[PDB]
Design a protein around this nucleic acid. Structure first.
Lengths: 53, 334
DNA sequence: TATAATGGGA
C-alpha cells in the first residue's frame, strides 16, 4: 500500500512474495504460534500455559 | 532534582525514524478509523470503544462488569469485523509510542517560557498535553514532519496554560497578552532614557488607543499581590499582615452600636399599633431584607396603596414625636 | 490548526 493509488504495488500475476531489504531487524525473545481460522485472544493481554490461543 | 529524573526517563525512549514516524502515524489513523467502523457494526459510541481499548492495553485494573462485557461483545464478532478490533488495539499502541518518542521535543520548546510564573515541570506537562492533541488529529498524508504540527500545539498549550494559571487572581487571555505588550516596552525605553517612564510617555510609545490613564490602570492589575508573610525589619518576629488592620470585621464598639440600634428601634416601634409598626417594618425591609412597595403591603393587610401610605405617614410622625422627647435615636446618625 | 524544530541551568 502507498499514499496515492498510483504508487500501490498491484500483483501483475499469481506469484509468491518475499521480503529482502530491511531497515532494521528486531529480535524478540518469544515463541511463535501460527493460526488458521479465527482467533479469540486479542492483541495485548497476558496468557498462561494451556490457555487457548 | 526532579528535572534530571524526567530528562533521564524521556532519555531511555529513543527517537523514531521517519519510517517509524510514518508507520506510527499510519496505525493511529487506521485505528481511529477502525473505531468508527465498530460504532457502525456494534452501534455504541466512539469514546466508549476508545476507553475500552485504552484499558485493555495500558493497564489491567465498572471494571469486572461494564468494561469486560463490552470487550466480550467485541470479542464475539465475525472475523471480517474483528479485524478492526485488532487494528484499533495496535493503533492505540502506536499513539502511545508516538507520544513517548516526542516527549524530547516538548522539553526543547517549553524551556523558553520559564520565569513567567510556572515552573519548568509545569511548562513540560501542559506542553505534553499539546503533544497528545497534536497526535490525535495529526494526518501524515500531508507529508509534513510531526515536529511541525507538534511545535504549534506545544506552544498553544503552554501559552494557554500561562494565561490561565500563572496569575493568582485570574486574568483574561487578551489582558495577559496586553500586559505583556506593555511590559516589553517599558524595558527598552528604560535603556533609552536611563530611567523608568511616566505613564504619558509609555502611552505615547504603545500606539493609538492608549493614553496615560489606561496604561496606569492596566499596569495596576498587572502587579501580583503582596504576601502577608512578607517579613518586616531584620527581626524575625513580625510579618506584613501583623500590622494590617481588619477593615471588614466590626469592632466591639461597632458590633454593640448595631445591636443598640436594633434594640432602640424596637423600643421606638413599640409606641405604635402593631399594624403601624408592621407596615414600617415591611416598607423598610426589616422583615425579609427588601423594601416592600405599597402594593405588597396592601395585599398583606388587605387594604389599598393609599391606606398603607397613610398608616406609614402617621406611624412616622408618631416616631418623630417620641424621638423629639426621648432623643434615643438622634445619634446613630453619623 | 502544518517548512522544521527532539535531554535544564544555576
Amino acid at each position: 500500500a502507498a499514499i496515492d493509488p498510483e504508487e500501490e504495488v498491484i500483483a501483475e500475476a499469481e506469484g509468491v512474495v518475499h521480503l529482502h531489504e530491511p531497515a532494521s531487524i528486531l529480535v524478540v525473545k518469544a515463541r511463535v504460534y501460527p493460526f488458521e481460522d479465527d482467533v479469540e485472544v486479542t492483541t495485548g493481554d497476558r496468557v498462561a500455559p494451556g490457555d487457548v490461543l | 532534582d526532579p528535572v534530571r529524573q524526567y530528562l533521564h526517563e524521556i532519555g531511555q525512549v529513543p527517537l523514531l525514524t521517519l519510517e517509524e514516524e510514518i508507520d506510527l502515524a499510519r496505525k493511529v489513523e487506521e485505528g481511529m478509523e477502525a473505531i468508527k467502523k465498530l460504532s457502525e457494526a456494534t452501534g455504541l459510541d466512539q469514546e466508549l470503544i476508545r476507553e475500552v481499548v485504552r484499558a485493555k492495553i495500558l493497564g489491567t485494573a465498572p471494571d469486572p462488569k461494564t468494561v469486560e462485557e463490552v470487550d466480550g461483545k467485541l470479542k464475539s464478532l465475525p472475523k471480517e469485523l474483528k479485524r478492526y478490533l485488532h487494528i484499533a488495539r495496535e493503533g492505540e499502541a502506536a499513539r502511545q509510542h508516538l507520544i513517548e518518542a516526542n516527549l524530547r521535543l516538548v522539553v526543547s520548546i517549553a524551556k523558553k517560557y520559564t520565569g513567567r510564573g510556572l515552573s519548568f515541570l509545569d511548562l513540560i506537562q501542559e506542553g505534553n498535553q499539546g503533544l497528545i492533541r497534536a497526535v490525535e488529529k495529526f494526518e501524515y498524508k500531508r507529508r509534513f514532519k510531526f515536529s511541525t504540527y507538534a511545535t504549534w500545539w506545544i506552544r498553544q498549550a503552554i501559552n494557554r496554560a500561562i494565561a490561565d494559571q500563572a496569575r493568582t487572581i485570574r486574568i483574561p487571555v487578551h489582558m495577559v497578552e496586553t500586559i505583556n505588550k506593555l511590559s516589553r516596552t517599558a524595558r527598552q525605553l528604560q535603556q533609552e532614557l536611563g530611567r523608568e517612564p511616566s505613564y504619558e510617555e509609555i502611552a505615547e510609545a504603545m500606539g493609538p488607543g492608549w493614553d496615560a490613564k489606561r496604561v496606569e490602570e492596566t499596569l495596576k492589575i498587572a502587579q501580583e499581590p503582596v504576601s502577608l508573610e512578607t517579613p518586616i525589619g531584620d527581626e524575625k518576629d513580625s510579618f506584613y499582615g501583623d500590622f494590617i488592620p481588619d477593615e471588614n470585621l466590626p469592632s466591639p464598639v461597632e458590633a454593640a452600636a448595631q445591636s443598640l440600634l436594633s434594640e432602640e428601634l424596637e423600643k421606638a416601634l413599640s409606641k405604635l399599633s402593631e399594624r403601624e409598626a408592621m407596615v414600617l417594618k415591611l416598607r423598610k425591609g426589616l422583615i425579609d431584607g427588601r423594601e416592600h412597595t405599597l402594593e405588597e403591603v396592601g395585599a398583606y393587610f388587605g387594604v389599598t396603596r393609599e391606606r398603607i401610605r397613610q398608616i406609614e405617614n402617621k406611624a412616622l410622625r408618631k416616631l418623630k414625636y417620641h424621638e423629639s422627647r426621648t432623643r434615643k435615636l438622634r445619634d446613630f446618625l453619623e
